[PDB]
Design a protein around this motif. Structure first.
Motif, PDB file in Angstrom:
ATOM      1  N   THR A  97       0.817  -1.209   0.000  1.00  0.00           N
ATOM      2  CA  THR A  97       0.000   0.000   0.000  1.00  0.00           C
ATOM      3  C   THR A  97       0.853   1.261   0.000  1.00  0.00           C
ATOM      4  O   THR A  97       1.853   1.356   0.711  1.00  0.00           O
ATOM      5  CB  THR A  97      -0.930   0.058   1.226  1.00  0.00           C
ATOM      6  N   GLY A 152       2.527  -6.551   1.638  1.00  0.00           N
ATOM      7  CA  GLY A 152       1.864  -6.147   2.867  1.00  0.00           C
ATOM      8  C   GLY A 152       2.383  -4.881   3.520  1.00  0.00           C
ATOM      9  O   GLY A 152       1.812  -4.413   4.507  1.00  0.00           O
ATOM     10  N   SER A 153       3.459  -4.316   2.986  1.00  0.00           N
ATOM     11  CA  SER A 153       4.013  -3.102   3.567  1.00  0.00           C
ATOM     12  C   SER A 153       3.099  -1.907   3.324  1.00  0.00           C
ATOM     13  O   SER A 153       2.340  -1.873   2.352  1.00  0.00           O
ATOM     14  CB  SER A 153       5.402  -2.809   2.988  1.00  0.00           C
ATOM     15  N   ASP A 154       3.166  -0.943   4.234  1.00  0.00           N
ATOM     16  CA  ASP A 154       2.392   0.285   4.147  1.00  0.00           C
ATOM     17  C   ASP A 154       3.413   1.398   4.082  1.00  0.00           C
ATOM     18  O   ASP A 154       4.217   1.577   5.000  1.00  0.00           O
ATOM     19  CB  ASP A 154       1.491   0.423   5.364  1.00  0.00           C
TER      20      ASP A 154
HETATM   21 CA   LIG Z   1      -0.543  -3.572   4.734  1.00  0.00          CA
END
Ligand SMILES: [Ca+2]
Ligand SMILES: [Ca+2]
Ligand SMILES: [Ca+2]
Ligand SMILES: [Ca+2]
Ligand SMILES: [Ca+2]
Ligand SMILES: [Ca+2]
Lengths: 779, 779
Positions: free
Chosen positions: B734, B769-771
């Protein structure tokens, strides 16, 4: 239950109650412009091609038959409104009295409601490509009334498919414009000034008009309650795009007892609207046009009239069946309330058969259709199953060929020449659909030879219905019906060649016929059941045997075995006795029995059809007349009449609750005993049943047959008939035939006298315009 | 005037008055079963193929949109009845209050009338090939009420053509049978136990039922006043043949304030009806199914959300335009209230363009359509204009080829891989439609080479619309648009080859692109008017010059000259200034001006179309987004937004009297200034405008673009915007993007920081899955 009655004096069917369980239709037009109109004024018009030149729209297979050609009347003092036809406004039948008279090429609508009498006659005049709406409004109340009239038609985008779909294109393909008393509809993509323009005009100078459907009808309203009619005035709409209509309005003030007359005209082509609205302002021109339509059919009906003990037969033969038969020949089979798109043009087997029925009344159209069919035949000898005659008016392979199409043409051509005496027709050179040309005579030999080639190892003609298309494919399977048809066509051709002195062909085809008879008598008779089988599967299994559980007795094979003249008197009587015993019902003869219930592709698609429906156990009307002919050849007139009476729509005038369809028209099929709706008639008008019924009764029951050298009279009637009379016009001369049956027999001529002189054999063609007395005594 | 409003919180459009000037529709279904339903519950369902598997009927282009999926309620104490949807009963709006909420893949209908509150939610649950009718009835009066409910659907004969015509066959092709709470509809000629059977079931055990349309509706009645509903009971009809319906009835007794809930289920396949009527008896299963539909779109919407100063933009991008765009990708372009028969399957250029729009939200369907298109491409390199993907799921000549179809596929494939990172896709072997196979990469080169071959002597791509089909034929005539499209596709391919290290192809296509640019800049610029011409006739006459009287300025050529990157900044600005000055209107950009009024076949069919309509001077929506992209490339964000705001349906919520069509959907075209209905929008939903609008705003105005090696953020917004925020999901990670515009410029990135660290260039794809926080400062 009944909804009307036959008016023999005026040759009209009178509908006294408009809430009939289905639309009862009529056909307007005798040349190129045609209208299929119901007793509720629902329906549509087209020009030449129903598929590509529809004039007004039609939303088929719905609870209402809309849109239509409507005239709305409105009392401007109260705001009350109603239509001259019951629907679409549908005023309470406890308040308004409606009557519809369907006549030959015209329909009269009448409405008596709350002090206003209104009549509307719709008919397509000869010489014009338009429909006249002759309207009469009379104030039958004791006070002054102010009544407004509004017309309505929804213009078609011309191509049926464009009305049904592809609106992303069609909604922007037309426009309306207005000139005094004329809404001009322009099919923008059709540049022809004639075919690319329609119109709705009025003889009166309008008070208001509407060319946009959405403005006339209004939002969330339909033909039952148009906004324009409710408010008492149109919006004077006219523009390009969206859906268009033809609505012209005029208000009238009527003194007690006063009546007015005016007309609306729906038509095709620029310039015609302005001309006709002016022409018909003189109502005498409307009356003259109507008189021409009466004359058109008076002339035709007069060529064959019968007076017999059977009123139902007389009523139908003297008008309705002749009318239905000629309608098929003129307009083909693809424009009704059932046929509303897709197939168009001519069905080869359909028209080939239809054309044998009325050469005495309309020889010109009969000749035209015969030439169309000859042009639609390929060198190989078979005919194009479905084609547009305009294609060949100055092609599929053997896989899509239906084995019987071309054979029906032979007896039809022979009959045409017998009737008209145009023996030179046989020498006329006509091009084949796939290149090259040959004389009519040679076209005929090509057809006969084709069937002689396409047979199985036992000598039976190939042909079996595999798919849902009523086509006898040549991909495996033999048909008894086709072999019998071949024999019949051969007998006809042999007589011709004999008449023309073509000895070589006489020998060739007599030999061919001989082989067909031997093969059929050897392989197609079932001596356990006592009848002829339907045919054989591609694997050689006989279909239609006494040992099978389903589909044992078949109407087509058994009737044709006799009609063709192939079957012996002995086998013929037994086969037809099986037909009577296993297929007869109060509604007519079933096509086969018992019905099929097990899918069997070796037998055909019929095994996948509902029981008692269509080809599987229903009362398919077309072949019924063949049974009548068969019985006359067997000399059993009472049996023939039992069959005729059972199918005659006339006799079902008071059982509409069961029949549903028009009691003045033959239908394609009636639900059989195996269906819960047994008795319901389906698809009136465009069925080959009418042509065959007419042919069977006139030529075999009444026994009047034109020939190459003379007129034959050899009737087969019920033994209790004391006799009958026929007026027959043949080759420009009239024959007043009187048949006497003092010994009460069914068939057998003891004597024939021509103008007081006894003669032996056929009546030689007499001088043009001569009137001849012919007395036939049976014994 | 307005008929509703946008409910941003619930992602629904709320219709507060049902008397909208046209049907406002919505699409139910996300897999194979689809329903096109209006705010009046009019419409139909189909399975996979709209042409061959229609489930319920539809009578199109009429004043009423019938039939539909209706629920009739009746007060058994008074006999009064009404429908939950306003139509078909149409209870007075002064007595009944109606509300319709169209949501993403569901529609809620509500009716409050004389003490009874009723709600009906129609939606197609994921995992089933059926439509659930979730009904709730509440007694809001102070007395005990007895209310009966009746369902109604008219079953289709499956083939659209069979519903519209050929009733001589279709009227005997189906039947109904009844089992507790289940009307089973059998398409008799379709033996598949799944596809050849439909049904209408109820969770309640019925008091009565009707399978025969004529019995439920009754004689001379329609959906507005069914006999069964009026009398308060069905006739328990079920039989083979004629028209069938699905009507299940149940009477309920409600205490004051009491409410009941039950459901009807319309579906396909034997066994499913009995299963689902039982499954949904536990309303929790209905709620769970509905929750899955909410989740389906919540997941998709969350992948790209924007918060900007423009509420109209936010509302549409965050829901409605994404929805419309994906609807096109999933269901194609041939099933609406306008497309109702004939064309079916996939339009090559349509889907090729549509598929570039939502690979971030629905990569699986995007990939599927891309593979469909690759399979529908021939070895020569061009694509089949119209085809059925099922044909190639384990052919026309150059005369029917449209010169641009295949080129749109190139940028789309590149975008798909950029978005998903599936670089291995280029090596996948896919068969050509006409035999043989090649990798996706080679399929692409075949397309590029085809256009390089089919050019004129000056180097411009062949292509001109001769007939009414929107196809750029190769039979003579050169198109500026096609050459610009070719250049764009080439630039995309060059970047790809560069990324893949295909040096040889990089040189080959860079050279090809160079030649295209030189040819276009030399021959297509009009230095008198200051814009690019539309093209040249087969005779070499330039079309779209400052010296001509008609068709001087064209939207497609000028916008693509810039969008493609071919035009210089200088020519680009002047050409687009001509577009603004001569084509802009408060409703959007006209396709060309002045409109053509003289038929000229050298120019094309456009000269035979009404002025201000379709291709001739109308506001054709599809190309409008190209103008937005062009303006962003020129750095004129204010100009881009002026164009966006003018076409945005959202901003026309209160001018329905002029627009007519849905304010939540882009349409194919709006009547131009030359037509009297200027402003009226035509053909909502299935238009490439939605996909392009979504692509233009997200990738160019907001400037967020996925790439082969990183994510780019280079916005072009109105100078007065202080900034905006975007949440973007890319390759499993994201990116929370914040754009700041302190110096109030329109375009130009001063700095970009990733997670607090300044970076130069694109944002490298981060871990799954990183933001990530991305701050972009313009300057
Ligand atoms: Ca995430
Ligand atoms: Ca025209
Ligand atoms: Ca010649
Ligand atoms: Ca005479
Ligand atoms: Ca089935
Ligand atoms: Ca391979």
């Amino acid at each position: 239950m009944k909804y009307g009655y036959f008016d023999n004096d005026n040759r009209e069917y009178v509908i006294t109650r408009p809430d009939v369980p289905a639309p009862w239709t009529n056909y307007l037009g005798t040349e190129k412009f045609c209208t299929v109109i119901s007793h509720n004024a629902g329906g549509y018009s087209f020009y030449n091609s129903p598929e590509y030149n529809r004039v007004t729209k039609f939303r088929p297979n719905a609870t209402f038959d809309r849109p239509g050609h409507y005239v709305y009347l409105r009392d401007d003092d109260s705001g009350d409104y109603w239509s001259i036809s019951w629907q679409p406004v549908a005023k309470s039948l406890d308040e308004a009295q409606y009557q519809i008279r369907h006549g030959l090429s015209y329909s009269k609508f009448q409405c008596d409601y709350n002090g206003i009498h209104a009549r509307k006659t719709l008919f397509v005049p000869k010489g014009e490509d338009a429909e006249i709406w002759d309207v009469v409004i009379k104030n039958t109340s004791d006070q002054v009334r102010t009544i407004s009239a509004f017309s309505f038609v929804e213009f078609s985008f011309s191509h049926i498919q464009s009305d049904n779909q592809n609106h992303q294109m069609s909604l922007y393909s037309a426009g309306t414009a207005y000139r005094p008393g004329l809404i001009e509809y322009d099919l923008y993509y059709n540049t022809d000034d004639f075919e690319g323009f329609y119109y709705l005009a009025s003889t009166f100078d309008p008070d208001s008009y509407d060319g946009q459907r959405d403005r006339f009808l209004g939002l969330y309203r339909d033909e039952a309650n148009p906004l324009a009619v409710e408010q008492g005035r149109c919006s004077n709409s006219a523009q390009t795009c969206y859906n268009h209509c033809g609505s012209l309005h005029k208000q009238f003030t009527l003194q007690p007892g006063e009546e007015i007359r005016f007309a609306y005209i729906l038509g095709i082509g620029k310039g015609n609207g302005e001309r006709l609205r002016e022409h018909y302002q003189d109502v005498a021109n409307i009356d003259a046009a109507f008189a021409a339509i009466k004359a058109h059919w008076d002339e035709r009906c007069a060529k064959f009239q019968v007076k017999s003990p059977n009123q139902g037969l007389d009523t139908m033969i003297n008008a309705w069946t002749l009318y239905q038969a000629e309608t098929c020949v003129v307009w083909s089979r693809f424009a009704s309330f059932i046929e509303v798109g897709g197939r168009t043009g001519l069905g080869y087997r359909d028209t080939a058969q239809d054309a044998i029925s009325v050469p005495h009344a309309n020889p010109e159209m009969t000749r035209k259709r015969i030439v169309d069919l000859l042009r639609g035949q390929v060198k190989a000898g078979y005919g194009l199953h479905l084609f547009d005659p305009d294609w060949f008016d100055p092609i599929h392979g053997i896989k899509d060929t239906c084995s019987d199409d071309h054979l029906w043409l032979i007896p039809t051509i022979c009959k045409y020449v017998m009737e008209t005496g145009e023996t030179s027709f046989f020498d006329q050179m006509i091009p084949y659909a796939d290149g090259g040309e040959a004389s009519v005579y040679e076209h005929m030999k090509a057809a006969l030879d084709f069937s002689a080639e396409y047979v199985g190892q036992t000598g039976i003609c190939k042909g079996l219905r595999a798919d849902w298309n009523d086509c006898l494919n040549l991909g495996g399977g033999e048909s008894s019906m086709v072999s019998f048809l071949h024999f019949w066509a051969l007998q006809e051709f042999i007589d011709l060649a004999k008449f023309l002195g073509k000895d070589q062909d006489v020998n060739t085809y007599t030999e061919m016929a001989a082989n067909v008879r031997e093969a059929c008598e050897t392989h197609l008779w079932d001596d356990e059941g006592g009848w002829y089988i339907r045919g054989l599967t591609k694997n050689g299994d006989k279909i239609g045997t006494a040992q099978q559980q389903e589909g044992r007795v078949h109407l087509e094979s058994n009737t044709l075995a006799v009609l063709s003249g192939l079957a012996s008197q002995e086998r013929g009587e037994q086969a037809m006795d099986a037909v009577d015993e296993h297929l007869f019902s109060p509604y007519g003869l079933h096509l086969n029995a018992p019905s099929f219930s097990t899918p069997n592709d070796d037998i055909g698609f019929v095994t996948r059809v509902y029981q008692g429906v269509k080809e599987n156990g229903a009362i398919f009307s077309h072949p019924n007349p063949w049974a009548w002919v068969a019985e006359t050849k067997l000399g059993r007139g009472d049996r023939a009449m039992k069959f005729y009476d059972a199918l005659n729509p006339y006799n079902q005038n008071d059982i509409i609750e069961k029949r549903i369809a028009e009691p003045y028209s033959y239908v394609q099929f009636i639900m059989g005993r195996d269906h819960q709706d047994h008795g319901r008639a389906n698809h009136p008008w465009l069925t080959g049943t009418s042509g065959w019924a007419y042919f069977a009764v006139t030529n075999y029951i009444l026994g009047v047959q034109s020939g190459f050298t003379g007129l034959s009279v050899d009737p087969c009637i019920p033994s209790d008939w004391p006799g009958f009379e026929v007026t027959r016009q043949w080759r420009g001369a009239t024959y007043h035939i009187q048949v006497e049956n003092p010994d009460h027999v069914s068939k057998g001529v003891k004597s024939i006298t021509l103008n007081g002189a006894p003669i032996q054999g056929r009546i030689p063609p007499q001088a043009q315009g001569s009137d001849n007395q012919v007395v036939v005594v049976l014994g």
